[PDB]
Design a binder for this molecule. Structure first.
Ligand SMILES: C[C@@H](C[C@@H](C[C@H](CCC(=O)O)C(=O)O)C(=O)O)C(=O)O
Ligand SMILES: C[C@@H](C[C@@H](C[C@H](CCC(=O)O)C(=O)O)C(=O)O)C(=O)O
Lengths: 423, 422
């Protein structure tokens, strides 16, 4: 069984089946499939000028164009961009940048980065260490610490979500104080944890994280691997949650996955420090594969000029979120129905009233995912969390089509749970 | 000044000036500039099918085609390939593979990798730690380093062959110091690239290999620069006559036209990793299809247009002879060296004394600036001057490049004298 074609939100196979890609490839095909204009952009750039050379003191014009456009859509203060080939490379570079920044400041001890259990930051040795996947962890490398994730369903006890957000953020303060602030370089997090299961923190979480980072002279880093380029309805997830990172990382969402690329966006304060040190100046000037940059430029231009991101914020996001909640909330073994913009999720649970999870977390998720897949719907299981992140161009009719298939699948899921004595 | 055009071995700028690219971009534009056929391959693959979803349990056909072609040009037994987006990612993945291999074998202590001072293995935290560049230093735990086989500096009263045995024995000494049961692998570039085209003696790699096998340590070649025909063989380890357990490749796989890299995994390590399962997803689903389509066109050209064979049989030996003929006579040039289409020399204060200039790098920069003013790109690595032009360079282009370089060296010698530095 082989894939033949993609268009919009659909994939087709050699047997003629139409498949709804409810995950937009690897959470990244934000403009959808079938952009022949991107192929033309790549073709043109490769025929004309696919290289630049450091012999010249100038930046390749395709990269200049991309950076200029990016500046218009990123938050204030992020004019300095260091391009990479992937989100994993972006995270790795960010780690080195954070540590070098503190060296330049005359604080060589300030080297520990803090992440979270169930956080994911790619697959380099550095990124895997900063991530908090139990299986991935030798690992972690030195100068890496972790705090618990803001997963209310599991850790909330009898706290309201807002109370819990403050408590979960204060775990960062506890860890900083345990290590000593003089040894802590940065806190890094995905605005919404992606691979961990679309863990959406309470509204009080990020502002308290930021208060803590600022109090203790710790840098704040957003990993926009999944939340970037319109996924939440804002251009970047940190904008939705209302925090101001000092740097943020981006992955191939920058090109909707059509060519490999990533970036580190470096805010004014950290950029000034890095440039004083000099170690990243070559990359600030010369980074960025020009062919990948031309495609990324076409992608970002489409996201803005075709109204795609604005439509997530104003139209399809709120529609998806309401329809998602209307569809899944009634099921006996579905809880914590959640989402923002065009990322959404729920958790398969043994007992909603008790907030009791199934044992062997992941086994039931796999069972449900297999039902979706049999019905030609791609949604992903992260443990027993079911997640979705379709192309942002999905229409209201396509949302409703996807939800109708998922609804049918959940009916079968509930029936199967019962039949197997697992309900 | 902005770059406007490249074709073959040349770049052009907005003033109409022709620049000789004696470094093939980042040591990687092996088929040369102006391959509009590669643009068509990218266009076709991106229009037809730039994605392949894991929902299908099959590999994208572009990637299958690339792997099938690669198997024809790699040595026997490299039946598993893990694609990445760069040489840096390849090195990082290789480190994780080596360590996981020994875990699967039930030797969880066997985790230290040994590299070399002045070795370069990319810019991830892992790769920077395995590399031995004094400024980059990190290192993360489980990384150790031995001295580089740089005879001009470290050879004392030994011949190069004698020195190669001693420099390789440094690996045995390090293994014994650490304890062999803690050592996972030795990693090296067949010729150190960024370190200055340090070409080891003929006795070196065979001894390194003997030592690795004696102590049950894996042997890894980093083919970042030597890969895809640079020495006249497809891979540098072939030229030097050793058989690594895995090797890493960078964007030379596509002549740099799109970002890509790979880890080529031999039978022993692949069978161990597959038993573990950790890399199976990558072995099956890795490789961006568009980049793979371009890499396929590149590798096909390197083979079918006879480019690699021509380096071995024809243009390589011509370059090497002409390079030595051109530079050997200069008072402040020594250790003229190279193989295939990578070559170098070192600027020195006194050849008879093997005396280097102080502040190693300052004189290299002076010489490099002269080349650049004369529209010739060759790189300085400290006071080493290095060259790695596109493999398609003709004899006329070799001689054109050398004549410019020769004129530049005459100016260099005059400038040294004038500045009181000779
Ligand atoms: C900074 C980054 C490396 C370059 C890629 C690199 C560039 C050259 C080098 O630094 O060795 C490569 O091609 O291997 C990137 O795009 O991110 C990383 O390793 O994290
Ligand atoms: C294994 C590698 C990462 C992937 C790239 C990665 C793939 C997805 C992931 O592993 O998170 C990315 O796109 O960020 C690679 O091509 O090498 C590395 O970290 O060295």
């Amino acid at each position: 069984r082989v894939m033949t074609r993609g268009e919009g939100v659909y994939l087709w196979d050699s047997e003629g089946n139409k498949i709804i890609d409810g995950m937009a490839g690897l959470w990244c095909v934000n403009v959808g499939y079938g952009r022949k204009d991107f192929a033309e952009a790549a073709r043109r750039q490769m025929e004309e000028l696919p290289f630049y050379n450091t012999f010249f003191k100038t930046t390749h014009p395709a990269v200049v164009e991309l950076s200029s456009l990016l500046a218009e859509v990123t938050p204030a203060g992020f004019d300095r961009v260091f391009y990479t080939n992937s989100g994993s490379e972006s995270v790795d570079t960010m780690i080195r940048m954070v540590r070098r920044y503190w060296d330049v400041q005359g604080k060589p001890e300030k080297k520990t980065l803090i992440g979270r259990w169930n956080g994911y930051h790619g697959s380099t040795i550095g990124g895997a260490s900063l991530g908090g996947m139990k299986y991935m962890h030798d690992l972690p490398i030195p100068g890496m610490a972790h705090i618990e994730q803001p997963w209310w369903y599991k850790h909330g006890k009898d706290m309201t979500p807002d109370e819990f957000g403050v408590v979960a953020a204060r775990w960062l303060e506890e860890k900083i104080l345990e290590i000593g602030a003089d040894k802590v370089a940065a806190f890094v997090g995905e605005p919404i944890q992606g691979a961990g299961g679309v863990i959406v923190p309470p509204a009080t979480y990020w502002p308290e994280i930021e208060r803590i980072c600022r109090k203790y002279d710790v840098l704040l880093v957003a990993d926009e691997v999944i939340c970037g380029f319109g996924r939440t309805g804002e251009w970047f997830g940190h904008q939705h949650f209302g925090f101001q990172p000092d740097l943020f990382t981006a992955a191939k969402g920058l090109s909707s996955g059509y060519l490999p690329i990533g970036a580190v966006f470096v805010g004014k304060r950290v950029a000034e420090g890095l440039i004083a040190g000099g170690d990243f100046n070559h990359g600030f000037t010369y980074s960025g594969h020009p062919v990948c940059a031309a495609v990324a430029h076409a992608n970002v231009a489409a996201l803005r000029d075709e109204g795609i991101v604005q439509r997530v914020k104003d139209d399809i996001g709120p529609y998806m979120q309401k329809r998602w909640r209307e569809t899944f909330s009634r099921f006996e073994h579905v809880d914590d129905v959640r989402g923002v913009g065009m990322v959404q999720a729920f958790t398969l649970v043994k007992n909603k009233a008790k907030r009791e999870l199934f044992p062997d977390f992941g086994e039931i998720g796999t069972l449900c995912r297999d039902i979706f897949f049999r019905n030609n719907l791609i949604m992903r299981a992260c443990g027993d969390h079911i997640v979705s992140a379709p192309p942002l161009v999905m229409t209201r009719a396509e949302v409703d089509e996807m939800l109708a298939v998922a609804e049918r699948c959940l009916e079968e899921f509930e029936q199967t749970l019962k039949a197997r004595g697992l309900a």
